[PDB]
């Protein structure tokens, strides 16, 4: 019964995002019948997320459109989470409430 | 002190290194070469060694397009270079070549 915490939150959110996509789509997409690209679809997920962090338009030449609309959906969600977190942290630092060594550098990188 | 002329050995080793490691890791590739830094390796890739770069004579259309654009946006080479599909240094040299041979 470990309890979510600041150390574990980013890891937690991405953990349950990988699970969210995995359960949803592999219970949603299927008929591969053997194993359908779970490792691979998730690698497409991390690839897309990096691409959006680098602001590089990400277009895979072949791909099923439900898979693509999938990735674009969840990626936009994680983008909304990350961005909102960034705004909020800059508000906290602006008011000078939080003194942390990491959140300042991270928050900087984000902006 | 590190700066200097590019060598066929350094350039081929740069080909192989870029092939193996990938485009986004420059510090790793600069580690193998001597007398060259990471910035220099990257800009040396994207400026010249990159196979997507077009090395050949300019057709008539490319000269029309280059001249027109250069009269449209004076002195901006990094904006024009992607539009004609050539390297900024290359289209520069070719432009001074067009004014040089034009008179």
């Amino acid at each position: 019964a470990k309890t979510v915490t600041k150390q574990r939150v980013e890891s937690h959110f991405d953990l349950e995002l990988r699970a969210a996509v995995m359960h949803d789509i592999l219970d949603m997409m299927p008929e591969g019948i053997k194993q359908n690209k779970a490792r691979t679809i998730l690698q497409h997920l991390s690839e897309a997320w990096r691409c959006w962090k680098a602001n590089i338009p990400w277009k895979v030449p072949g791909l099923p459109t439900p898979i693509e609309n999938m990735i674009l959906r969840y990626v936009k969600a994680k983008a909304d989470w990350w961005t909102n977190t960034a705004h909020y942290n800059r508000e906290r630092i602006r008011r000078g409430a939080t003194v942390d060594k990491t959140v300042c550098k991270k928050n900087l990188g984000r902006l | 002190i590190k700066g200097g002329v590019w060598r066929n050995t350094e350039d081929e080793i740069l080909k192989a290194a870029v092939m193996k490691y990938g485009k986004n890791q420059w510090s790793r590739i600069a580690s193998l070469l001597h007398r060259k830094s990471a910035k220099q390796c990257k800009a040396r890739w994207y400026e010249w060694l990159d196979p997507s770069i077009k090395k050949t004579e300019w057709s008539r259309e490319e000269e029309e397009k280059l001249l027109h654009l250069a009269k449209l946006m004076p002195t901006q080479w990094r904006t024009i270079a992607p539009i004609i599909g050539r390297t900024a240094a290359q289209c520069l040299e070719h432009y001074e070549f067009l004014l040089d041979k034009a008179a």
């Binding site: 008929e31 690698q43 990096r50 | 990938g22 485009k23 946006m73």
Partner: peptide, 27 residues
């Protein structure tokens, strides 16, 4: 065949307006 998935081999792990002409020639 449709559900062939391109391997996600990882890489980690342009047009112009004609108004520029009117402006530049104007100046």
């Amino acid at each position: 065949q449709e559900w062939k998935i391109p391997p996600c081999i990882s890489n980690w792990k342009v047009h112009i307006n004609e108004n520029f002409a009117k402006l530049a020639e104007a100046l």
